[PDB]
Amino acid sequence: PRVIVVGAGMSGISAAKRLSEAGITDLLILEATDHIGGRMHKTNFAGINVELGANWVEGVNGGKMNPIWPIVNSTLKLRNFRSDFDYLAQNVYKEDGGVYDEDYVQKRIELADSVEEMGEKLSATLHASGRDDMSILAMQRLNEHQPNGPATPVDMVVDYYKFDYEFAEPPRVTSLQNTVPLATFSDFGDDVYFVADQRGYEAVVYYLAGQYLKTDDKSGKIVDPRLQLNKVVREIKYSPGGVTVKTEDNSVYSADYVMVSASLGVLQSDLIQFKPKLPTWKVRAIYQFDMAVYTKIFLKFPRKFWPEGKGREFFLYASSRRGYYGVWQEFEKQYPDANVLLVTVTDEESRRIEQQSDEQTKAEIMQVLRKMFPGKDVPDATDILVPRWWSDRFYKGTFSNWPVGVNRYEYDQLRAPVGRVYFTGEHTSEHYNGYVHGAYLSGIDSAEILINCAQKKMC
Amino acid sequence: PRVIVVGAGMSGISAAKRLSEAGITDLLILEATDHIGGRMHKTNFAGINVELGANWVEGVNGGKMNPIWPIVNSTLKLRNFRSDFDYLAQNVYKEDGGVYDEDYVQKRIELADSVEEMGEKLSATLHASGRDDMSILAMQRLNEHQPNGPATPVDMVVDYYKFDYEFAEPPRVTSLQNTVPLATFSDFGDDVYFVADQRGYEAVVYYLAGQYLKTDDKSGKIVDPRLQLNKVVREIKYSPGGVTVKTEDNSVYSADYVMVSASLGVLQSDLIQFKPKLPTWKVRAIYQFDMAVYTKIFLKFPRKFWPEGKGREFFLYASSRRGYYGVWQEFEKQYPDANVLLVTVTDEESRRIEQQSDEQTKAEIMQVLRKMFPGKDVPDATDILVPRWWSDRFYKGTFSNWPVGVNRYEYDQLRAPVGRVYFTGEHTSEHYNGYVHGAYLSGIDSAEILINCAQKKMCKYH
Ligand SMILES: Cc1cc2nc3c(=O)[nH]c(=O)nc-3n(C[C@H](O)[C@H](O)[C@H](O)COP(=O)(O)OP(=O)(O)OC[C@H]3O[C@@H](n4cnc5c(N)ncnc54)[C@H](O)[C@@H]3O)c2cc1C
Ligand SMILES: Cc1cc2nc3c(=O)[nH]c(=O)nc-3n(C[C@H](O)[C@H](O)[C@H](O)COP(=O)(O)OP(=O)(O)OC[C@H]3O[C@@H](n4cnc5c(N)ncnc54)[C@H](O)[C@@H]3O)c2cc1C
Numbered sequence: 001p002r003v004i005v006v007g008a009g010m011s012g013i014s015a016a017k018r019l020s021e022a023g024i025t026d027l028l029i030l031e032a033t034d035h036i037g038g039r040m041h042k043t044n045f046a047g048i049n050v051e052l053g054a055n056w057v058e059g060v061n062g063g064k065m066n067p068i069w070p071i072v073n074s075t076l077k078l079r080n081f082r083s084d085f086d087y088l089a090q091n092v093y094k095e096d097g098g099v100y101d102e103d104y105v106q107k108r109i110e111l112a113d114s115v116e117e118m119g120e121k122l123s124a125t126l127h128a129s130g131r132d133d134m135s136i137l138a139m140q141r142l143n144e145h146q147p148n149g150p151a152t153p154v155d156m157v158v159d160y161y162k163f164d165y166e167f168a169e170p171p172r173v174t175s176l177q178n179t180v181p182l183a184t185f186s187d188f189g190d191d192v193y194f195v196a197d198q199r200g201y202e203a204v205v206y207y208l209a210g211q212y213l214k215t216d217d218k219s220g221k222i223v224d225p226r227l228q229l230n231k232v233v234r235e236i237k238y239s240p241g242g243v244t245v246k247t248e249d250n251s252v253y254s255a256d257y258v259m260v261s262a263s264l265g266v267l268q269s270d271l272i273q274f275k276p277k278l279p280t281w282k283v284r285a286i287y288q289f290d291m292a293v294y295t296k297i298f299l300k301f302p303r304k305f306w307p308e309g310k311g312r313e314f315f316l317y318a319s320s321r322r323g324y325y326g327v328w329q330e331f332e333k334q335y336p337d338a339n340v341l342l343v344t345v346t347d348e349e350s351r352r353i354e355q356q357s358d359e360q361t362k363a364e365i366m367q368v369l370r371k372m373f374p375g376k377d378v379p380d381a382t383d384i385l386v387p388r389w390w391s392d393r394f395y396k397g398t399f400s401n402w403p404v405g406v407n408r409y410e411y412d413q414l415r416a417p418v419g420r421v422y423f424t425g426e427h428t429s430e431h432y433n434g435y436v437h438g439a440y441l442s443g444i445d446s447a448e449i450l451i452n453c454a455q456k457k458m459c
Numbered sequence: 460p461r462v463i464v465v466g467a468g469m470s471g472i473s474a475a476k477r478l479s480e481a482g483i484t485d486l487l488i489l490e491a492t493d494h495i496g497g498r499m500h501k502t503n504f505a506g507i508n509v510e511l512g513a514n515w516v517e518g519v520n521g522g523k524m525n526p527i528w529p530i531v532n533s534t535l536k537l538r539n540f541r542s543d544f545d546y547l548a549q550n551v552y553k554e555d556g557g558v559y560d561e562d563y564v565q566k567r568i569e570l571a572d573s574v575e576e577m578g579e580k581l582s583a584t585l586h587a588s589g590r591d592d593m594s595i596l597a598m599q600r601l602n603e604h605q606p607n608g609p610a611t612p613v614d615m616v617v618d619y620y621k622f623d624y625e626f627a628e629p630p631r632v633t634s635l636q637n638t639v640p641l642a643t644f645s646d647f648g649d650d651v652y653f654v655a656d657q658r659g660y661e662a663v664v665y666y667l668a669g670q671y672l673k674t675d676d677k678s679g680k681i682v683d684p685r686l687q688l689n690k691v692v693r694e695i696k697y698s699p700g701g702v703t704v705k706t707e708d709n710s711v712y713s714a715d716y717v718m719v720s721a722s723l724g725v726l727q728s729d730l731i732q733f734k735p736k737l738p739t740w741k742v743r744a745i746y747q748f749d750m751a752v753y754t755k756i757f758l759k760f761p762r763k764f765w766p767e768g769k770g771r772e773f774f775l776y777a778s779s780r781r782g783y784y785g786v787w788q789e790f791e792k793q794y795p796d797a798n799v800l801l802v803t804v805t806d807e808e809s810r811r812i813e814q815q816s817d818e819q820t821k822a823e824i825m826q827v828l829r830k831m832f833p834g835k836d837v838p839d840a841t842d843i844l845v846p847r848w849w850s851d852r853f854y855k856g857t858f859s860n861w862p863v864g865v866n867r868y869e870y871d872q873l874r875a876p877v878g879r880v881y882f883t884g885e886h887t888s889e890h891y892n893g894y895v896h897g898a899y900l901s902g903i904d905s906a907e908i909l910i911n912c913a914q915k916k917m918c919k920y921h
């Protein structure tokens with residue numbers, strides 16, 4: 001059967017690969033941008049390549065092997081480093097200047113950890129139907145006996161680093177049952193390794209693609225006509241006998257099936273028109289799940305002024321405004337000579353910042369740093385890079401997040417095909433939504449569902 | 460039968476009144492503060508009395524009579540004014556100076572209202588269990604076909620005005636099924652009236668209390684000994700046989716039943732100790748519901764520098780930072796010539812603001828005002844009032860909000876009595892949670908449940 005695959009990010013390339021393996025080689029992969037890899041994407045900033053998107057392989061060293069790991073660490077040997085969060089307590093900056101007392105901070109962190117652990121015990125007792133689910137915030141109130149969760153600047157920044165820095169939305173919006181604990185860590189292990197290689201984390205996608213598409217023997221570039229870039233799908237017509245797909249450049253294609261890998265955010269926009277319209281059950285499941293936004297703002301400076309050394313990699317800024325430029329990282333190991341810093345923001349701050357100029361953002365950031373290092377002469381950053389994933393029509397966000405209120409069944413309707421229209425992507429991952437490994441496994445699972453239906457007539 | 464009522468806010472007084480009416484007169488009302496009224500309470504600001512808490516009678520001129528309306532508008536004749544929001548599109552300020560084009564703004568408002576009307580149709584069809592609920596935000600995404608809700612400065616302040624200004628938490632956290640549409644409005648009417656009377660909205664509570672508690676001939680002061688002020692209940696012991704209540708000043712009292720009217724926030728803090736400890740199902744129901752915070756920041760100036768006149772009462776500040784000093788009100792009718800402005804904030808901003816000095820908040824507000832009226836010479840406020848309800852241990856917030864995640868059955872567990880312990884208060888109103896009328900009705904309702912048990916020996920709950 002001929003199958004069209006929309007998008008060449010991790011899940012599409014992974015699905016097309018699994019299909020090829022089942023012998024379905026009459027594939028046509030239509031990618032909107034001029035390159036493959038999607039949300040795994042590097043860029044040159046200040047003379048070095050940095051990740052605009054995914055940057056870590058998360059869940060390593062546990063009882064099960066994360067499928068992405070061996071590819072990164074062994075096959076490609078991409079250069080990487082294990083992240084150590086053990087010293088945060090020495091690195092939390094007061095709004096006004098200097099760090100807080102390490103011991104006071106270590107205790108707040110412990111407290112927050114213990115609450116989360118009680119949350120894990122509670123979560124384990126909820127019903128599968130999801131009828132007792134609650135937000136993480138609700139769990140925090142219950143466990144600490146208060147009418148509110150973390151509320152002082154220090155408590156809030158710890159709360160942010162613990163939850164928003166991972167999920168990109170606050171605990172109060174997040175489903176407890178479906179995030180605490182996270183399978184990723186539960187199955188694959190607690191460690192995370194930051195990929196810092198000039199070839200880019202995306203190299204993992206290129207490697208997979210190359211196992212089945214044709215590439216130039218000199219170039220190594222993919223040259224298989226089954227892959228077509230700069231193809232923006234804008235309409236998908238389907239019927240019980242097949243599908244027709246139309247691109248923005250006016251091409252029209254026909255196939256037996258279509259496998260849609262665009263992000264949940266793309267699905268929640270009107271970029272692709274379905275004809276007929278998708279059924280209400282499908283539409284509702286789409287709009288109920290969240291497409292979150294995580295913005296990695298890189299900054300380059302004329303010289304260093306922050307600390308470097310053991311436990312110095314990660315540091316927090318405890319603003320009285322929750323989530324305001326709060327999570328910092330310095331790359332003494334990764335980009336040794338650079339003078340680069342990375343501050344991460346999400347959600348509301350991300351949408352606000354995407355909507356303003358880089359210069360305006362640089363100026364806000366400069367005020368924060370000077371507040372943090374009142375004792376130093378802080379030079380203005382020379383360059384800044386603000387990724388605009390929510391504004392990008394091909395992504396509309398960075399990764400899904402499971403909101404309180406959505407149960408497994410509705411989550412499942414997200415993965416559900418509609419006649420011959422199949423779906424894949426990180427938001428369709430049964431237990432690893434949000435992650436690279438989840439996009440990867442989702443491609444395989446989606447492809448297998450299509451295979452059984454198409455090939456064995458078992459749908 | 461002897462009953463102790465904890466709290467002399469609207470619901471406790473209301474409940475006591477109903478028990479009194481059923482002939483249950485061996486009552487003891489224990490009030491933490493030195494006064495009655497609870498969340499209805501005025502204060503002197505710059506020479507005038509302003510309401511720190513409730514300020515409107517919401518839901519008027521509809522199909523049914525809001526029980527509070529007649530007391531306010533007729534029985535007591537408290538000075539009041541219908542609020543008119545028809546001219547908002549002419550009063551939305553740019554983060555950086557002046558207002559937006561009215562036509563541009565009205566279109567955005569109409570769009571927002573339409574999404575909401577679509578939301579009400581969806582809400583009517585959802586399963587009664589609440590198991591199919593979703594946040595207001597999910598509904599917005601669905602109807603706008605976007606991966607986010609209102610996200611530009613104008614759209615965001617309109618959203619906040621439409622939702623946070625009523626509920627005190629964002630749409631994304633709020634239950635659609637339970638707030639859109641709102642019964643208060645469907646049943647009693649779309650209008651709202653702002654009470655601006657020197658005796659305060661709390662006069663309604665004093666009036667009811669007076670219908671059954673003893674007052675002095677010219678004091679008019681209640682002096683019935685069944686009302687004890689300055690009595691903080693810190694412990695409630697209950698058994699098949701009865702109940703014992705202990706206050707902070709060591710007083711101890713016994714009764715056949717106790718009716719607890721303290722806010723949801725008080726319940727979530729652990730001010731009152733229950734012995735034995737409340738059952739888990741009850742504890743969970745208590746922690747799951749939300750206690751919101753709505754902060755009325757009053758400001759006094761040496762001169763006016765803002766517009767007054769038709770459609771001038773309400774104005775918005777379209778900050779690129781959601782919820783940032785966004786909803787303003789001028790008092791040309793209520794406090795003529797007093798030069799006072801009221802800016803309202805909630806939720807995250809409320810908590811931040813309660814934790815810093817009033818001087819710092821005033822300076823933040825001065826900066827906003829000067830960006831708003833750049834061609835004027837904006838004098839610094841000479842006085843500011845920042846109510847701190849969340850920090851007050853007898854309140855711990857302003858009013859409940861129904862969050863996505865709490866279902867019908869869970870809400871009933873929140874209301875449910877435990878042995879001889881009954882609960883009441885706005886958070887126990889099934890259809891009017893959060894409101895003064897909801898408090899008032901919840902009092903009569905809890906009382907009746909108790910009356911059935913006591914007087915008719917009908918003691919099973921649901
Ligand atoms: C800022 C950021 C930080 C992250 N951090 C990490 C991390 O450190 N670790 C981790 O495990 N995960 C992380 N993630 C998540 C991870 O990158 C994703 O889970 C994964 O890459 C998504 O793969 P996908 O195939 O589902 O989606 P995508 O990668 O979005 O692939 C979909 C593709 O479809 C294309 N497309 C869209 N619309 C159309 C159209 N109309 N026609 C044709 N093609 C179209 C897109 O261009 C894209 O190539 C991060 C992501 C981001 C963006
Ligand atoms: C800022 C604000 C704005 C609002 N705006 C409006 C509005 O405009 N219109 C409207 O309809 N509603 C509004 N409300 C909501 C309204 O005020 C409430 O719904 C209602 O007043 C609550 O009454 P209640 O009896 O349930 O609780 P409360 O008034 O809290 O009564 C409980 C009483 O118990 C006392 N108490 C507490 N703990 C103890 C203890 N341990 N022992 C003894 N006594 C104790 C408290 O002091 C209080 O007197 C607002 C409230 C606030 C605070």
Ligand SMILES: *[C@@H]1O[C@H](CO)[C@@H](O[C@@H]2O[C@H](CO)[C@@H](O)[C@H](O)[C@H]2NC(C)=O)[C@H](O)[C@H]1NC(C)=O
Pocket residue numbers: 060061073074
């Ligand atoms: C990731 O890959 C490196 C690459 O080898 C691992 O480091 C080696 O492990 C073998 C196994 O015995 C040793 O004999 C080599 O000497 C090690 N190399 C180095 C440079 O130490 C590493 O352990 C891998 N990490 C994970 C998490 O799998």
Ligand SMILES: *[C@@H]1O[C@H](CO)[C@@H](O[C@@H]2O[C@H](CO)[C@@H](O)[C@H](O)[C@H]2NC(C)=O)[C@H](O)[C@H]1NC(C)=O
Pocket residue numbers: 519520532533
């Ligand atoms: C609020 O109360 C005032 C007080 O009476 C109402 O105004 C009266 O309404 C009756 C009804 O026709 C008239 O006969 C009186 O002449 C009115 N009095 C005045 C002073 O105008 C008013 O209509 C009430 N508002 C609401 C919403 O009930």
Ligand SMILES: N=C(N)NCCCCCCCCNCCCCCCCCNC(=N)N
Pocket residue numbers: 056165166167178179185190192399400401402433434435
């Ligand atoms: N929990 C641990 N054992 N450790 C976690 C260590 C923190 C790692 C810091 C990395 C910075 C976070 N980058 C996260 C991006 C990953 C996308 C995942 C979204 C998952 C959301 N999932 C659900 N909502 N169910």
Ligand SMILES: N=C(N)NCCCCCCCCNCCCCCCCCNC(=N)N
Pocket residue numbers: 515624625626637638641644648649650651858859860861892893894
């Ligand atoms: N919906 C209308 N027809 N109009 C409403 C007009 C807006 C009124 C503006 C007055 C300012 C808001 N004061 C609100 C305080 C009231 C407390 C009640 C909270 C409601 C909680 N309800 C639920 N979450 N279910």
